[PDB]
Design an enzyme around this catalytic site. Sequence first.
Site, PDB file in Angstrom:
ATOM      1  N   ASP A   1      36.737  16.257  19.812  1.00  0.00           N
ATOM      2  CA  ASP A   1      36.921  15.107  18.943  1.00  0.00           C
ATOM      3  C   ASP A   1      35.903  14.034  19.283  1.00  0.00           C
ATOM      4  OD1 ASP A   1      37.690  13.003  17.352  1.00  0.00           O
ATOM      5  OD2 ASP A   1      39.616  12.677  18.342  1.00  0.00           O
TER       6      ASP A   1
ATOM      7  N   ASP B   1      45.340  11.338  11.958  1.00  0.00           N
ATOM      8  CA  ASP B   1      44.333  11.456  10.910  1.00  0.00           C
ATOM      9  C   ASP B   1      44.822  12.275   9.728  1.00  0.00           C
ATOM     10  OD1 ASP B   1      42.549   9.834  12.071  1.00  0.00           O
ATOM     11  OD2 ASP B   1      41.360  11.419  13.026  1.00  0.00           O
TER      12      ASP B   1
ATOM     13  N   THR C   1      35.309  10.724  11.341  1.00  0.00           N
ATOM     14  CA  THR C   1      34.866   9.970  12.506  1.00  0.00           C
ATOM     15  C   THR C   1      33.591  10.559  13.093  1.00  0.00           C
ATOM     16  OG1 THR C   1      36.204  11.307  14.004  1.00  0.00           O
ATOM     17  CG2 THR C   1      37.250   9.427  12.967  1.00  0.00           C
ATOM     18  N   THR C   2      33.560  11.878  13.264  1.00  0.00           N
ATOM     19  CA  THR C   2      32.439  12.515  13.946  1.00  0.00           C
ATOM     20  C   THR C   2      31.238  12.672  13.025  1.00  0.00           C
ATOM     21  OG1 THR C   2      33.919  13.682  15.460  1.00  0.00           O
ATOM     22  CG2 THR C   2      31.714  14.595  15.134  1.00  0.00           C
TER      23      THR C   2
END
Lengths: 517, 508, 72, 514
Positions: free
Chosen positions: A49, A380, A82-83
């Site tokens: 993550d 999420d 996010t990534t």
Amino acid sequence: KSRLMGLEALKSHIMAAKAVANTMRTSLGPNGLDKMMVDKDGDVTVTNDGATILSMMDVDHQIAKLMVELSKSQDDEIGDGTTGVVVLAGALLEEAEQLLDRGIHPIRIADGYEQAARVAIEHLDKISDSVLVDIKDTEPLIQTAKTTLGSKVVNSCHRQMAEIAVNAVLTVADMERRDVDFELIKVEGKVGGRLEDTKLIKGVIVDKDFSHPQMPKKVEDAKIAILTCPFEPPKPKTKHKLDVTSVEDYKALQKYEKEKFEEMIQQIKETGANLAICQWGFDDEANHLLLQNNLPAVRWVGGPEIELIAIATGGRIVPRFSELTAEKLGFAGLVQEISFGTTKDKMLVIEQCKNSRAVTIFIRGGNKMIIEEAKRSLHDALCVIRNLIRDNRVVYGGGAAEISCALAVSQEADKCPTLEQYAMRAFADALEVIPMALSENSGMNPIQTMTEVRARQVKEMNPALGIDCLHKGTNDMKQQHVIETLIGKKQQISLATQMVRMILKIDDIRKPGESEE
Amino acid sequence: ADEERAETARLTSFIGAIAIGDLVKSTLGPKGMDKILLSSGRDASLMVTNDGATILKNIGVDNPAAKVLVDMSRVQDDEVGDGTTSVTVLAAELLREAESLIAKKIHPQTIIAGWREATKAAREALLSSAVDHGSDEVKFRQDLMNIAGTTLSSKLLTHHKDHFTKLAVEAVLRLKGSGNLEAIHIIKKLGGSLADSYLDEGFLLDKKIGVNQPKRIENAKILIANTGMDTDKIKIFGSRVRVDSTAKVAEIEHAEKEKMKEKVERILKHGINCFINRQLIYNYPEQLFGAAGVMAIEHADFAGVERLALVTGGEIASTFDHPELVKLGSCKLIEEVMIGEDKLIHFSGVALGEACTIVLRGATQQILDEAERSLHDALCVLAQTVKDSRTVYGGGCSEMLMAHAVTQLANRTPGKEAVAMESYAKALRMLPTIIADNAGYDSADLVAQLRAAHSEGNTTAGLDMREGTIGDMAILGITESFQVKRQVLLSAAEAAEVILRVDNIIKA
Amino acid sequence: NAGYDSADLVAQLRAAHSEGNTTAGLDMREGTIGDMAILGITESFQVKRQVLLSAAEAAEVILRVDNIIKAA
Amino acid sequence: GTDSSQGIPQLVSNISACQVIAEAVRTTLGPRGMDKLIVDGRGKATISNDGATILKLLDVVHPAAKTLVDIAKSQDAEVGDGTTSVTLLAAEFLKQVKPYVEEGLHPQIIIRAFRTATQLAVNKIKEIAVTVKKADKVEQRKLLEKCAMTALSSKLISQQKAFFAKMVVDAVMMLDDLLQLKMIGIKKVQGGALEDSQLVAGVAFKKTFSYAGFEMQPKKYHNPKIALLNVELELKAEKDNAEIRVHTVEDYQAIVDAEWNILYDKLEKIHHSGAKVVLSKLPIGDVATQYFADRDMFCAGRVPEEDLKRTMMACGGSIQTSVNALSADVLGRCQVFEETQIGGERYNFFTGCPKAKTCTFILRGGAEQFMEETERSLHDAIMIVRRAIKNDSVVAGGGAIEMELSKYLRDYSRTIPGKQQLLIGAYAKALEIIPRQLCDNAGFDATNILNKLRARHAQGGTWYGVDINNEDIADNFEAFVWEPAMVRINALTAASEAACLIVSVDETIKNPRS
């Protein structure tokens, strides 16, 4: 300290923001590779993550901090993404390099990427823009709560994690208000449970249980006595704190608080609330009395929680043992300690079928990271779900939109006579990392893998079919149920391009060196 | 701070578990060269350790890669048993496989799936040659014996294993449906015996019973109590603060003898002559506790009363109040039996039954511990023998056979990942390599011949590598539960694959 | 030489001749496994044995000489 | 000991000291004018496109660097704009006399001749200067929107200026009479949408503290009596450190329930102060809010002093030293209070502030890192819209006049010289470098563009200029790129002496040494 400008400050900015993307693009997607990350604390954290990586990441190069920021923005609203915005940054970053190497000016480069991102987020709008209610959304929610909870490692065997989210934002916030309350949704989790253990609680579960189960373990609807009053020492702020060593004061004290706590507990029985929640809660001496009073009541309570017991239940506040009145009674649908089949897990659900102002989505698991895995799963998931439960607008992922976006942008780049005709087309180029790393996450040769999607998008001209995101062999996005909030890519893109753009707009670096914090 | 990249994250992954995986290697398979634990850093000691879990924490595990198998292997022995030595070596064997594939640059995805793919197929293949030796309960007792036979092996025990074989067998036999690990009670002491493991009537207890107090008791019915004192009683009067002078520092200690005497009377209200206060007393207390007629017997074991709370129909609880709160323990004769110059108050008149106390008298506490894990594993794996009568043949006779199909599979079954699955079917046979050469045999004619000897169906044929030979597993009796084979892989299976796909290490 | 990942294609062709197979083999023309019909893709045994007769020895032959000595 | 140095080695080091610094602001100041992340401390990382701030942020290791700060900063306080360019102009001659200094040729008139040269411009600057106010409309608040449009367009969004420029006018109106950032003080929002703002002309509170129920605690007052309080009410209130002995006996419940009560007084003295909307920079406590939500008078804690001050300036109110509010002017007061969530955050908005001279803006951006650049358009525009108010005489922005002047001046390089055509030529050209930088920090060409302007400056046209966005020839005032004359006037006079000052200095004494 030193002034650093131009290509100097460029290659300053280039290093980590490019370098950090690498571990995260190897972590990209479920096929994204985990990373054991060990502190100087002796800690060990295995993270694919990036949002957790960035959190785990203390590394230098302030830009490498700004991604720790930027993922968290998209982390709450969009959920997933996010990534990718991080790994997309380093993409268009190195992509920006050779245009300056070409002699394309630092402010020439950024804006070519920027307006081309408009077309992208504009082209994104063409995938699926749908909007549905919660009870319909749950199907595209759980199909995505496949991906989200699953890209968070085991959605598997859970619509329990999936469909309490369908309720979560739903109950705390309306569909149309679109005001982000994950703050009102209580995401609670407990080790010693199971991933197969997940629960929606529209009210508050308070871990503290009845002083004794010999006293009634069910308090009736409401009749909760809101008490900020000591039944144990209330860490009272005024005096020097000393216990007595003599039998003389040992006897003189023990008759003292047997009188008050009982008549406190009877005063609670007098206030007509058969549960006493006490912000300064119960030691055993008051509990014998409490047991002797046969009054169901609550031991030590977190200070704001008895307040959170108020709002989340709509509970009317009885401030203190001095304010006591029988009129104000806290809300509980049913007061009981909850063992889920996990008995080490015991909380007292204050369960509101009347006024629920904090919805506890309570998930469990074997261990810390497990529930954490399940929490950021449940986090999420709902966060992606929150978009789709509000506006269920889905792009199908894994580079299927990238080509789709890279296509229109590319030609329209050339259509723009401006110098950014290259940059806007150079923009469409770095979009391809998204299937690329995923291809190599999925363990495929991207350069072919991606133009499959191209050949697809050459034909399809939409994410539906795609490559393997899950490495399953069916190269699909729609059909592989790779389903991504169409808001989020627009989010994710705008996050990447503009953060970088200021990184591109900031060429002027006063630091002792290339990078800094 | 720090961002580590894959190469070191993979290489450090490789080295540590490999570095620890070869600690017990020659001690694994059958017995090759043993493994000496030299402790030079924390102390000065000459130690011999064939145990991973021992060897694990002793040497620094602080390699984050080592931490994985150190944890995973530890968890595995703690679950299925004797898995640490396995898992520590197994993923170490695995790391070498992909390390080439990594060097070949084979997609990290590829090796993960193929191994885990083949991890099923081999345990799948491990499922077949798994054979019930426990169909008949006596054959099951014989199944319990051979399965315990491979467990107690390879460690250092002189005569001890013989008591534990039958006992790991007997812990199952009398309990009806599980083995007795807790009903068995571990007493590890140095007695008059340099090697002993035997059955303990009730549970023996250590103390010097002197002075006036009678040193034996008859017709004992124990009042079970966790409440008591040491030099100060727990009661209303249990605390006195007085020192105004230097004489008082002397006087303050005399009033301590005031606190002991008042409880000596309190055991007399129940009138119970056999009363366990589980807290210790001295001879001068034994002088005082001998006057009343109600004795406080000191340092009663918790599990030993649980031992009694099992068979006697009594209760093990905390604190205490009055005799009916915690049910009265009862033992025919509480006796003091001297072992050597020291005397042992012995709770007896209660022999085995629903539970067992086991007193090991070794020459060292060292020999006492290596039998426990031997027992502990033979206990659990014979509890695995309970449900699954299956014992799949030891000496890695499964490994090669697990590797047989997977090899044959990998060719056929994947049209790519044979890289992993063959490598899987490769590493499985490393354990036979490290022993067969340690055996003096040529592993090359072991891991494959004897494989295709047993893997093509002579499964009793297996490793007798303490003869340096192929050997007959059922005949050697060297075999252990099919359930001891699977999970030690499944632990080790992920023990490797974690750090394989670990491409970065952040450090605070 | 064709620039194609052999492992799979090999393991494909493996999983072919693992299964056993004749009519299909790796074709570097298209670049991937294809028909062996004697398309030109299935090729004269005469060379092969000769070739396969030849370097097969040279190894084991030269395996005799680790014993190399030099008047140099 | 003491250190000193003289002459060319010092004197060149005197000019060497300066030219290093002006490059910090070099490519800065504009839409394609670069931006400076300057990290002068380990965890201290600062970003400005303005010189004065980073001048304040950066270390000055030279008398030059010291003497420079105010010079650029001199243009800061004026328009809010133009430090970077004054920094550019100060050392811009310093390279031109490096021929002379390496000639060793320096009669001091070089600085003294640039002065009348500085005179002929600031004179000519105001000559061509034209009042926009009485010239534009009869209205002069769409003039401000013109300025707002143009001055919202020179850094970031021209997208929203069509919407924002009318509000920039409205902010300036309530800004004007007291010229303040706090009273245009913006409250950022995000997540309710991307990239928008709206003017709220009363005040607003970003912060507040309410628990023990909120949706059950009144969030709004249609006649707020606004307590602007710095007071704190904690879990239990204490006037004593200790007396006797946490447990004992009589002493246990004795402290606790009174520790409750000492709050109640401040809990009361707030509520009977006419504090219904209650505002305390220091937080209201939980049991306080248990009390406050029990008393159903809306409290606030963790409150911004600026929010407290924006109100006291908008209400004519006051921050209060006492929980008791006797005076409605020591108190704040409005005819509207609301806790309403724009974007979802709890906010305390005051409309009905009798003065209401604090305009607040509720602003959304595109992303995390895209938002700063947006409101600086709002902030710049006001400053220069107000600047368009302050000096109504206004010329073309974007360095339109310099090329003309550069011509007009070295026109004297034909007219002036027995000597100083050099000086007049060298004076003339340094003008152009500021927008040429803006041209060049756009990555685009100036000698191309600026000379084309000059070709029409050879026509006699002056306001001919560049629009820094398009970066091509134009007439800036016809594009209505704007600055008042005095903006151009000071930057010269600011940097002119700076260029003049240390050139009289061949020598610097350091007693502390070095």
